[PDB]
Amino acid sequence: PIPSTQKAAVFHKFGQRYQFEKISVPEIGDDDILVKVIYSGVCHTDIHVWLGDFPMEAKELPIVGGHEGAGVVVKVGQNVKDFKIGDRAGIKWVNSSCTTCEHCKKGNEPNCGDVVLSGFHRDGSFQQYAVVNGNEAVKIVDGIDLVEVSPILCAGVTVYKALKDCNIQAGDTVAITGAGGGLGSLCIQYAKAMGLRVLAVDAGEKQMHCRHLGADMFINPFDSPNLVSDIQMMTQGGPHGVINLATAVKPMEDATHYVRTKGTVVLVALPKDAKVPVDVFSTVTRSVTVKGSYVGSRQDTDDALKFLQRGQIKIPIKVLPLESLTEVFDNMINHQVTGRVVLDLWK
Amino acid sequence: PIPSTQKAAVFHKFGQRYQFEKISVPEIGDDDILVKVIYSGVCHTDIHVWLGDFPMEAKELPIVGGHEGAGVVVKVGQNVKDFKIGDRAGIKWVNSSCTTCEHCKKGNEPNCGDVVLSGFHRDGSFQQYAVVNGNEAVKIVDGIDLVEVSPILCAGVTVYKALKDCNIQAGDTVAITGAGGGLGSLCIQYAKAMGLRVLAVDAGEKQMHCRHLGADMFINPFDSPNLVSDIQMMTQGGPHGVINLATAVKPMEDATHYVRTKGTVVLVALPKDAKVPVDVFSTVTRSVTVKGSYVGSRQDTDDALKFLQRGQIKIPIKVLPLESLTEVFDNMINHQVTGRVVLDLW
Amino acid sequence: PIPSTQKAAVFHKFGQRYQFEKISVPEIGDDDILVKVIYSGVCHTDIHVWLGDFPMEAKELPIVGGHEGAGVVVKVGQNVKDFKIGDRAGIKWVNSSCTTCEHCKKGNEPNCGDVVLSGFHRDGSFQQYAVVNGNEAVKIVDGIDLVEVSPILCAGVTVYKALKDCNIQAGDTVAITGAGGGLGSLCIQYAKAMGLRVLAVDAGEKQMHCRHLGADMFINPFDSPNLVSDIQMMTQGGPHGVINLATAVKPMEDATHYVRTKGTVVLVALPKDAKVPVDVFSTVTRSVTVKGSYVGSRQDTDDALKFLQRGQIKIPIKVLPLESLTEVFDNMINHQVTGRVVLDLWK
Amino acid sequence: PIPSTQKAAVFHKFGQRYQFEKISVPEIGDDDILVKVIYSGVCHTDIHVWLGDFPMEAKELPIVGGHEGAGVVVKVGQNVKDFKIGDRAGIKWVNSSCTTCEHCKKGNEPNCGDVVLSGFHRDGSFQQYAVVNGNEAVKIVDGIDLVEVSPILCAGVTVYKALKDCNIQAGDTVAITGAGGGLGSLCIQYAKAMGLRVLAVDAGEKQMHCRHLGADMFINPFDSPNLVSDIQMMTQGGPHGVINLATAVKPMEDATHYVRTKGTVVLVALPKDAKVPVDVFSTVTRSVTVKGSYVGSRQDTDDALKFLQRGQIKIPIKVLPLESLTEVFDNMINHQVTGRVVLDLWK
Ligand SMILES: [Zn+2]
Ligand SMILES: [Zn+2]
Ligand SMILES: [Zn+2]
Ligand SMILES: [Zn+2]
Ligand SMILES: [Zn+2]
Ligand SMILES: [Zn+2]
């Protein structure tokens, strides 16, 4: 028996308290799916949704956050055909779409005007039971633990989509800015899974961490005077691709500076008040392409999922209770993002 | 027949001034080819040859300017296979290349470390007889007036390469900034050849010229305070691709502003002191691609040349001598608006 | 005598052709003053409040616009010190200010945090009786035409302060972009009143107009190919000052190009999504200063009205009713010239 | 004790290898003065003189470079009325001026048309004996170390002049971008010497150096995602002035972003391919002024030197031989300085 009440984390207003409180269990729409989310991931966007910094409008309306959730389908709608009860499903950033849009008929559904967003426009994965469109829902393979898939739902798909947006060939050099973070570690693992020579740029103790994951090179801004020259000496002309994972505005310009001739620099993050200038003369002469990578489509999601399923990508995670999620948000204000943290909805 | 003197313009060092004086005939390289230039075009990169301002080291030694030139092959070198004597050929920006470099083997020769640039590292098109690599040369079909071919070798090719860097499908809307200029008059026509709905942004009443080159709609900076708003209103969300021919920094920033989501913004020129900012947030959300377009490849060259051959492109041009071409040149140090300027040796 | 219902133009909605409508006469403020406005001016900023274009949010409440109003005080209001019934007064863009801010003690009141703006924050001059703070209200001299003082309330003070911000010496060259516009004609007359050599830049048949205003020579973007070179030729190295009235971005960048070494380029307009780049090399070597001029101080206001009273400044206007002012609103979004407009409240 | 031959570092061609040659000692003009240059500073401007990248032309191609030199006067010309042999003298970037130009009467000699520039048009301080105009030469006090005064001749005077162009009062906040560089350290010390509150923006926490120089707050691009917001928090609305030493483009637009209302943003360097855009709306509403500071005037130079004399400003330096100067030129064509290099023209 589907329950009638659940535990969720709800903030009524921007900046307001997250509440571990009892709320009604959602009942699914005709095209939706009801998922007992057992584990949910926390990316930093949830703090930006809470702050309201994005020009977009959060539902507020007592919103439950979350865009990365793994669970089991417990109820299906009337017009849902391909899903069966007991299947594993994922709540992604793209909750639903119009599906007959210019952007929706293309391969990129999240850029539709009538997009429904988990944790922004719709109640997200921080609750025990969540509703998601069956068409945009994730097919998670049985025989892998949902705890490990939860970070893949946003971080794995995004970093994989960025590497694919680089249009890089096997053997080329890819540079990962901010490679010591969780997103960066996943970028390193995915790039090695695509047969790419990996160069890693970040400040601090990450020199050991990247090699822990297999990264072929690491560079420290703390010790290295000019990143451009050092990178271009280690890559013999610049990296064929650059992934700007750090949101600091200076690594973006450095990436644009040290990228190889005909190289591709992709922005991945969604930061505020950050701009990347570049000399038109050098952009034309080197024919570099600055590409923006948004959230991936279902096909990219399925690829990224298969990478973890086959064992190419493994991200260590710290499991925390839904009650303790409040503390987690505090860490995000202080930039204490700890690897990848996943929440057990039961606790 | 060949002469032993050829009327060209050479500097001895940086900062010196030209002259029409006949100079010794350049020997042919073994893979090179000697072409008698019948007509030659003039772009501002030749204006940038002087003063040594471009960061890439230049032939401070004696150097002949000029890059775009159409003429007849009078002789070749030791090893050449596909060329026949008497054929019509064109010299472009890329004179020769490493031919086995990473960037040269990929298919993009202009990007080698050992690139030869006509009018920078070899004698250009401002001479009567010039030597250029046969593998990087133009192949002109007979029956086409050379006066009209000269602008295709540089401006037409650059416009075609820019339009193909947009990766636009038949039917999308393309916005061209600086469409009243020569680069602009050419891009509107090349875009119309692709089945592209053309939107043009230029200042003044160069509109009628645009509109009647086949463009759907025209936008005027004088009239509009916000080009972005009008452009996004006329295209229903922004153009799928934007080609930046104007070098003003504002059109660059506007191009990134009014471009459609999943759009393609292309830089074309070799502009000094130009910078294109873009907010990372909107580039990521719109999944925008800001790409830089350099010279076209041999295949792109032939596509543009065949567009000239088949009658889809029509270009106004103006014939003046090499002997009598420092007036228009200095006028252009002041960026004199000049119809395509071709150089008839005679 | 003073009615209880008045004719006015109010757009409760941002984007509505606002209807000539009867509204309640405003309740007199405690320290404020009630002014029967007999003539009111129309500036392009009035359109932007209607458009909702400005990042600064206008009053989401019923707003009757206007920042330039000339009238007679019909009720004095409490906490007023020197205002007397029968005095002539002017409603400015700055309706009131905190008067005890870091910037308010600095002598520049419009940059206070608690600033109230006529036609934006408080009900403006398009109504029969309007409320304004006594300290920022204009002292218009009795015996002087109200129709003609109305345009000075926004254009005269602003262009005069811009010329003050050019910090130009007697005999120096000033170049005025958009000199044929409403702002521009006043700029030419004020600059000639301060002993400056006027150069005028505008498109079309306006050359005789500007030269009749006292402009020494005229340059036309329509006929002249390169404005920078021609201006530098007319001035022997560039104008000592430039005033950018047109919001077109081309003249702003050209102004930074052709301004003389050690020159001063002053921005005046309030445009949308328009940026001014400048080559760091050339701005440093030429030591040019790009300075922005916002609303004038009370001292600047009285200086400009002094110019009008003594006859140095003459404004041309077509007196129109409040009716058919929606025609001119459409004309302003139409990107089109119609001439300076002053409205008689009676009609 | 004047021989007829000296040691100098000369390059006959742009890009030529500089040579430690013996060359004839220059013959002093009647209005010139001959200074045994004992110490000479090396800033990146000399490297741009060598490259010929600047739009101007080192027209002396047979050229000994150098714009900052400290030495003893060993000979004067016929028209040198007030200088004495044994006095200390400084070779500044501005070697001489016409003294009858508009810009020369205004007090700004470097913007003269007939200006001769040390290390560019006239032989500079890289030689043992150098010639400089007696009117434009710097008066260094006897009893001060020439090695330490030499960097003030270019860095100290320039940062002092920029801080002067800010026209800031005692107690206001000034923000220094690139505060960890040599220019940055000098401006921090000068700004403290004028009674300002210094805020410093640069890379690394090793910049406790800035806190030692007197900077009141410091912000790190590494740690802080958005510098603008944090700076405005630390200054309660933005710094009253900004001094842009870094030529990176993003810091220049960021400086324009976070500068307080009615503030002054000053550009200082002479970079290539650098440009500062700014939104006209915010420049007008905030009345921000983007001003460029070129080299200082003689009054500015003596004001700056008095400060070193009194001990408020100190420039740690690495002393290198005149022979080794080629190494210094080699590094700067590649990347920035590791410190203020000064040449003992004895070695
Ligand atoms: Zn996320
Ligand atoms: Zn859609
Ligand atoms: Zn060309
Ligand atoms: Zn090659
Ligand atoms: Zn220096
Ligand atoms: Zn002078």
UniProtKB/TrEMBL annotation, chains A, C, D:
Cofactor: Zn(2+)
Record bears the keyword DNA-binding: no
EC main group: oxidoreductase
Molecular functions per Gene Ontology: alcohol dehydrogenase (NAD+) activity; zinc ion binding
Residue ranges annotated for the Enoyl reductase (ER) domain, each copy included: 15-343
EC assignment: 1.1.1.1
Keywords: Metal-binding, NAD, Oxidoreductase, Zinc
Coiled-coil residues: none
Family designation: Belongs to the zinc-containing alcohol dehydrogenase family.
Identification of the protein by name: alcohol dehydrogenase
Species per Swiss-Prot/TrEMBL record: Bursaphelenchus xylophilus
